[PDB]
Symmetry: D2
Subunit: 445 residues, 4 copies
């Protein structure tokens, strides 16, 4: 059967939380204290080597008050029919079942009065609902819960694994083999994985993802990850560890966006920001996964032009039409753009750059809910609104009259030329500019 819920009330970080669970569920976050204490919350209920020591003074919320620790595990237990897992758990709970028709089962922990005798006194109780919970009979040192479940903890009989930080003293090619053996191998059914490395998250299927937030209220969001899956997961494996992911389309934009972010603050990686190269203008294949994850996508797009196939003389918009499909709206009409054949070269592109503003001026109301949503659109490319902000400083580097002419020929080659000569006082006006609000929305400040 599957896990359903856990209700950890008065443990050392939690107040009243209901984390939804599943088999094969993976824990990540920015804090290590909450990811350690969520595994010790499972060790205090299902493992006797932690349950035999009792509760100390430290694991009562902060250190005291509201002295009733409850950990309640939910495991449903109404699959019946085929599997031997449900039979091997229903054959031992026969004094604590209300009927053979209930659909939720309860494994409840209780602990009271740490102020007297300096002991936690864990009482375990079985039942089918929160009314009429009946305590677990056990003769000596061993409960009737401990005969059934088995807990194996890893840090460098129903079996539940608990793995904390396995990539420390592990090779980076071995983590992909461990990512195969955790998920597509049928040996492991019930684990609770805590990790920090993206190579353990390459091959995932039927997996609930618990993200632990960096704030002190330690609230968790549980999302199922259901699904070329491998290239969709390998590029997004470093973006699963970030709440705020900027989606840029090319490698030369990341060269400027690394330096502009590193000249302002080193702590954008510490806050949870990430730069993701899409490699093209295909943004819909990532946000269908990030809608299910709930990761806040930030999208920067540039609009372009295209002649129609069977129609000559009218042009079909590319960037506004591909921004239309991310919201699922009705596509706009085609705009007749005329180019005379006697003028070619740069001046056809120079007239089409002014046509890119002339298709932007009367479609500003379309951008009025685009930029109100999480998609941002430029006017020609990134190389022109780079020139509209710091273009008085680009002339001394290139030693040329028109730096846009020098940059559109070799695109990625001359973005290296902007790296080796910049100042810390330079390029702060492009940081606070309104045309680069995606990098404001990444850092959250």
């Amino acid at each position: 059967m599957k896990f359903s819920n856990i209700t950890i009330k008065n443990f050392r970080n939690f107040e009243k939380v209901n984390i939804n669970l599943d088999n094969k569920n993976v824990i990540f976050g920015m804090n290590d204290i909450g990811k350690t204490n969520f595994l010790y919350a499972l060790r205090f209920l299902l493992d006797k080597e932690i349950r035999k020591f009792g509760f100390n003074k430290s694991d009562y919320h902060k250190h005291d008050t509201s002295k009733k620790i409850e950990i309640i595990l939910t495991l449903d237990l109404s699959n019946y029919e085929k599997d031997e897992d449900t039979k091997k758990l229903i054959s031992v709970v026969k004094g604590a079942r209300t009927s053979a028709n209930a659909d939720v089962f309860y494994i409840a922990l209780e602990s009271k009065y740490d102020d007297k005798e300096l002991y936690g006194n864990i009482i375990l109780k079985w039942g089918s609902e929160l009314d009429n919970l009946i305590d677990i009979p056990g003769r000596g040192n061993i409960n009737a819960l401990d005969n059934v479940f088995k807990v194996i903890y890893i840090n460098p009989k129903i079996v539940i694994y608990l793995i904390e930080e396995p990539e420390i003293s592990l090779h980076r090619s071995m983590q992909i083999a461990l990512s195969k053996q955790l998920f597509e191998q049928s040996t492991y059914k019930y684990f609770f994985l805590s990790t920090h490395s993206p190579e353990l998250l390459y091959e995932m299927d039927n997996t609930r993802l618990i993200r632990v937030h960096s704030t002190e209220k330690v609230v968790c969001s549980s999302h199922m990850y259901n699904v070329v899956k491998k290239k969709l997961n390998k590029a997004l494996s470093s973006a699963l560890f970030a709440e705020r992911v900027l989606l840029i389309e090319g490698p030369s934009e990341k060269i400027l966006f690394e330096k502009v972010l590193d000249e302002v603050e080193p702590e954008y990686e510490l806050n949870g920001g990430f730069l993701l190269e899409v490699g093209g203008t295909y943004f819909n294949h990532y946000v269908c996964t990030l809608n299910d994850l709930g990761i806040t996508h930030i999208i920067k797009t540039d609009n372009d032009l295209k002649s129609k196939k069977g129609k000559k003389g009218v042009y079909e918009l590319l960037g506004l039409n591909r921004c239309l499909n991310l919201l699922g709206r009705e596509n706009l009409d085609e705009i007749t753009i005329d180019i005379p054949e006697d003028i070619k070269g740069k001046k056809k592109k120079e007239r089409l750059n002014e046509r890119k503003k002339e298709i932007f001026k009367q479609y500003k109301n379309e951008v009025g809910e685009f930029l109100g949503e999480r998609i941002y659109l430029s006017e020609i490319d990134l190389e022109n609104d780079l020139y509209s902000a710091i273009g008085e400083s680009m002339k001394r580097i290139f030693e040329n009259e028109d730096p846009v002419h020098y940059l559109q020929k070799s695109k990625l080659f001359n973005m290296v030329e902007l790296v080796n000569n910049l100042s810390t006082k330079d390029c702060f006006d492009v940081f606070e500019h309104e045309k680069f609000a995606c990098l404001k929305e990444l850092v959250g400040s």
Copy 2:
């Protein structure tokens, strides 16, 4: 209310022991392993910090089998009707006490299936007798035995103390202060003391003593002690020698150290008395169970107001340890001659005749553990090694040079003795006390 018996059946040394206890138990012996495992048996019965870990494979007897560990305590409450502990312990049992007419109570430990799941498991059972033992109810991690008793273990509610080796890093005046503090204050009511030092047993009264043995069968003797600084070192020895003089111990230390220097670790001890009295020592040592060996010398005494009328002191002094009637007085007329030398020499020839026609009285003396000479110890030493006395004294009579000043010329012997010399002291039947101390 006070403890009566323990029944530790299948523990890691014990096989079937019924060890009688009381309050203020004191454990000594030549093995530290059996005393540590006795205190571990009390920790697996009454302490939750050792009960929460369970039994290992090594906690059973040998490496495997005889897999039913019983540690059963006997409390013997009866009805004392004024003490607060008995009313409290009959208040917390409630349903597991069968009647108010019963007097003996049981706390029973069980352990089964060590070969399955690699766990010993401890099951605790209350009851008024060995039949109809009922399980102790407990809700979570806490038994109802844990709400009654408290165990404090010392190694450098109802309170039980367990003290193992407190004289390591402790001054001896602090050992005497701990000795009066253990048996004077009312806070130390229940303990199980394990020690090696004689200074912790100076003040001692109303004390059960457990002497564990050096053998592997780990059987022990329990003796109640109810009522001198050198007698406290004799409590650590099963077999002691009762001698009269400080000059005798100088010879019996040199003769024992030239052959067998490890007689002290086997369990032997030499106890100086300082006189010919032995009835004050064996009346204590019979209650201890300590096997006494007595070497004494017979003497004679004249009467009062009579000349030539004598009685015997040393034969009647051995007779007073039995309870038999005294001997008749022996009359002898002594010649005048040399008073300093030959008047003693007539009495030494008379005392050999007195020992000759009272040999059948000595036949039940030396058959039991009291041994007796015929003149003194010095002529019996002169009959053994008198061919070696004249080569180091340069005198015609070495008994004459040594009877006047005894201790000052006894160190003239022991500074020059070879390792080959005095092998005949062990092989004499006259000096069988020094072989009876060894036990061969």
Copy 3:
């Protein structure tokens, strides 16, 4: 002033090595013993906290014999006349400096008589050449080598850092943050870095490279590196495969992992390029000393201004790596017909007709480390496993269905393939590039 050589003679892995060094130098390899013992060989020469303990039995080579341990550091100070560190070195050498025309300096360690007194003993010795080596004067516990240098060892005056494994308990952004700081700051002038992570080698300039081998003779190559995210993972391998496609790496991650999953620990690596350019990679890896293997495919391009005039780009991209002269253009006339499929099918026969009578050019291509196919990789994949493509695709022509979706139908072959299938791929001459990844 910057280092040029070391001579670690009889240390516990080394027999006779003369390892060239420079500043900011980086050690990597497949053994951690051979990278720990290099930093301990520097700590035994230049750090007093390891030199004060002496040599043990295990610090010599093998368990015993070859009993003269020499660690010799070569400075090559020359005459720089402006820097602070050369004058700070030469002001305190004093009497051991021979003349001002000398350019080579020595620090010679010695060790003798390990079998006597259970002590290794370390004797330090300055000098300008290997003849006339004079001892370092030191009055008490402190040498005159200790007044010049300083060693700080990192494990989670003239200052030498020694860093061993810093990415253990370090975040992946912090490795790229540490990667610039070793090579732009003036504080880290002299270090010896040991690592396993590719993120610490992103920013890298003016760096001697020490690669230790997996063999037991622990010989190493000293290569200067002077001047990309996937290329930093290719620095930790000797045999790398240079492929064009991301869909092609999906094809070689099934064939390798169904037979030999331990190819990554042996020292193999798959490097995507993203295009048919290879001259930007092997011009870098010639200075790296990394043995490249290149798999490429030949193509043809019509020339501008003419109809039916073609030239061969795929042979010229193999010609430019060796520096030979280009080939001449060919003429072929192709009819109209079906332009999507049947126009390509005549070009495949013309490409095979080109590949038939240019085989003597390919005879030195495949004799070098560049490998060429016949039309494309998906069509001599059809020569290997084309009898098994019709089970999964259920199509008449599987390469008609595969060329229109190069990546979209490759996961159908990856997701449905047995372990017995694609085992004959390794013994083709067409797919013989993947055997030199393993090295068999």
Copy 4:
């Protein structure tokens, strides 16, 4: 060879000490800190495993100031002729031996600059006198001092032992066997023994004794101990660890003083007081060993009477001539004491107590000269001035008219009747009384 003297200047407790030390040194005292620092001073001079770590900040005088730690050892080298250790030390110091005529040799230590480089820098120097000290040549890690001396430290070539606390985890007969292995066995020549137990001092000959005082200035008393020896050392083995020793004569006088001393304070066992019972009126055999030790003797005696063996009618004083023999003075003349023959029993003793009081009246200058020295004399018997200050409370427990007559018949048997029941208010008036001034002179408070 023969050690002479050490000179430890600026080490952890010492300021300027010249502690005379021969072969077979035995160290006792009330502090373990100064004995451990004396053995670590010998380890910082002659052991390379302590010299390779150097001096810290903590092993200067307080923690700083007087920045020259100097340990100078004298061995004096001038036995010549026969022994091979003298030939070994004159064969290894072939350079720094100035002549073969001077009879003093030095092994020095120097260290400076604790505040610079945080390192002690021990420099060792050989010399024949304090002028012209010469550095020891050593090639690498090993000095030329380390080839000669060998140091073995025990805590549970010239071979020098250092033993600290060996009686922990040993039997008492093993301590007697270890004393026989140390002193009368010729395996150990040079040692520095530190101990707390009396059983390691039973067999003892040719031994320099260092007593370390309990005060902070750590001054040491250096006395050579030369000598029935075995029972004298068994009597004095618990008295060598005490600086104030009371010399009493009986066990009844011991158990009188034991309850009275324990009801005031338990501090006197911690301070260093000890009651040594003799077993008779022989005191000259104890003070001849305490004069060589320097232990101050406190002596309680009682004066008696004896008839002369050759003259009838004149009595010879025993207790006054016994006190005269301890000072070596001229013995006083005999006093004619008349006893009629018809008066027998205890009626003779009642006049004999008055005749002893009449002897004590006219020889008051002699008892004043005795009590001006370290010997104390009673009026007649301890029981009479027991009765003179307690004996109004001795009639309520004996239920007798005369408690002196009730106690002189059973001297020990009725002495334990005072032990089991006395209040703590009792025997405070006699504790500052002048007749029991030895009991106040034991503790010195």
